Amino acid sequence: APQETLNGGITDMLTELANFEKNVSQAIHKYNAYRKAASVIAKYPHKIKSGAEAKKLPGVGTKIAEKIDEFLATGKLRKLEKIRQDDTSSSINFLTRVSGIGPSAARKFVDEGIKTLEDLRKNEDKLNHHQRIGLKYFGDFEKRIPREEMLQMQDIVLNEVKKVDSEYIATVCGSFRRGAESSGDMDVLLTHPSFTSESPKLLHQVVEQLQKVHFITDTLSKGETKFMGVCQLPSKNDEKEYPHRRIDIRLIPKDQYYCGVLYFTGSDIFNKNMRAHALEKGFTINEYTIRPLGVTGVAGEPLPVDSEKDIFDYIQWKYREPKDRSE
DNA sequence: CCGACATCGCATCAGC
DNA sequence: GCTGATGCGT
DNA sequence: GTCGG
Ligand code: NA
Ligand code: NA
Ligand code: NA
Ligand code: NA
Ligand code: NA
Ligand code: NA
């Protein structure tokens, strides 16, 4: 992990441009183009001396190379400086930090004069359920979660799930499963022997129980297979109350469980790489299954998977411990 | 030059 | 009432 | 915005 002081000015620049493309210009692909350029440069173990040097990295093109040259020569970007001072654009960009408020809602709000969290408060009836919760926990949702709190959160989830039905299988994935010292949220993958690709209250009972012991505090969305909400650890005697945290609970069919555990454990860089390796081996891996590719390139039928190991075996790859899946 | 860039559950809008 | 499209986070 | 058919 190269020092950020190496090319941090550049990575921050690209990241900022990324947000404006996504939130203001509504160009998701340019958003990702910038992110990809920011990521490949954040990994470059050398201080970039010119745009041409960066141009050699995959993801960096002529336009970004030109912007780097300007930033290296002036310590800033004219277009960025200008958009930063634009009241409309800066307001739209900012509002998207509220969970539930995307580019469209942000633009809609700003057009009608609603530009700050204060404006949002005075106009609660103009917000949907999700957005109201995002506003209520604006601060908490941007805070990170120390691993110690994740362990405590896991303790509660695993205990309550087993209490509902000892046959449930629950796995907390995400970077937490890879040993991360902090997490941005909690992702729980749930399954049950009675639930398979071929045969609906399993998820509900679990959410209900977590609400019963006051762990889950709010609901953003809830269907038969996916729950997205808010949780909070119990407060310690006469001590500071814990921040509210984002938690997702997915119910997955037994036969697709381990592909799910693999996919949601990542990391993204690892998933991308494992998918790559899978392909050159005649296999395609998504969050649901692993399928063999046949001559023409069409994916056949899902292969039986009884664990993460099975997936690794198919692609003739040694099982990799989650801690070693940073890439 | 120009199409791909991930997919899809859930909440809610658009429209019959 | 419904189906399908869109927004959002994923 | 970048890559690549
Ligand atoms: Na390049
Ligand atoms: Na948002
Ligand atoms: Na956001
Ligand atoms: Na039991
Ligand atoms: Na999906
Ligand atoms: Na329709």
Positions of CATH 3.30.460.10 in chain A:
144-263
Cβ neighbours, 10 Å, residue A274:
20
Structural domain A144-263, CATH architecture? 2-Layer Sandwich (3.30)
Residue A295 Ramachandran class (φ > 0 left, ψ -120 to 50 alpha, else beta): left
Full 3-state SS string of A115-167: CCHHHHHHCHHHCCHHHHHHHHCHHHHHCCEEHHHHHHHHHHHHHHHHHHCCC
Superfamily of domain A4-86: DNA polymerase beta, N-terminal domain-like (1.10.150.110)
**Residue whose entry in the numeric block shows the structure tokens 């990324």:** A18
Task: In whole angstroms, give the CA distance from residue A286 to residue A266.
Answer: 12
Which residues fall inside 5 Å of ion ligand 1, going by CB?
A 60
What the block records as the tokens of A103 is: 């580019």
Structural gaps in chain A: residues followed by a C–N separation over 2.5 Å? 199
Positions of CATH 1.10.150.20 in chain A:
87-143
What the block records as the tokens of A66 is: 């030109």
* DSSP secondary structure string for all residues of A160-221: HHHHH-TT-EEEE-HHHHTT-SEESSEEEEEE-TT--TT---HHHHHHHHHHHTT-EEEEEE
Positions of CATH 1.10.150.110 in chain A:
4-86
- Nucleic strand C contact set for A 210-229 (CB, < 7 Å): 228
Give the distance (Å) from ligand 6 centre to CA of residue A104.
Answer: 21
- Active site residues per annotation of A: 67
Strand order across the beta sheet in which A169-172 lies: A169-172, A186-191, A245-251, A226-231, A216-222
Q: Which CATH number fits domain A87-143: 3.40.720.10, 3.10.20.30, 1.10.3720.10, 1.10.150.20?
A: 1.10.150.20
Burial of A311 (0-12, 13-18, 19+ CB in 10 A): buried
Give the distance (Å) from ligand 4 centre to CA of residue A167.
Answer: 6
What the block records as the tokens of A98 is: 């509220």
Closest CA to A203 of A250, A155, A153: A250
Cβ of A96 near strand C (distance < 7 A): yes
Name the pairing type of β-strands A169-172 and A226-231. Answer: unpaired
Which CATH number applies to A264-326? 3.30.210.10
